[PDB]
Amino acid sequence: KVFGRCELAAAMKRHGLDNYRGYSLGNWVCAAKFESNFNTQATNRNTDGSTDYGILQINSRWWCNDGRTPGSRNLCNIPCSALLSSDITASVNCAKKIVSDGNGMNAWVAWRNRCKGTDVQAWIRGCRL
């Protein structure tokens, strides 16, 4: 499912990401835009053989099991496939664990490079929330 921008802002809010660990909703939308272009099915292989999955490109090195990332962890206790569902519940719950881990949203390289320090509130402009 490719979410619309406001559609995804609404779902993220519903699931409690608005100001989670202090990050306003626009941060999460911006991260999703540049991680996956709002496509829940997005996947991308990393150099180390790990893979990023879903709307927030959560990595199999630490967070989810895909059966093919040797020596990895599954800290969200989920198959990485669950991160590709049209329902974002699993992504959001796992993102909450990630963002709580110490480096906040810097965990997401695209957030750090493309969202951090920018006017992220623009990502939710015009949305009914």
Ligand SMILES: [Cl-]
């Ligand atoms: Cl594995």
Ligand SMILES: [Cl-]
């Ligand atoms: Cl922080």
Ligand code: NA
């Ligand atoms: Na894993």
Ligand SMILES: [Ru+3]
């Ligand atoms: Ru850790």
Ligand SMILES: [Ru+3]
């Ligand atoms: Ru503005």
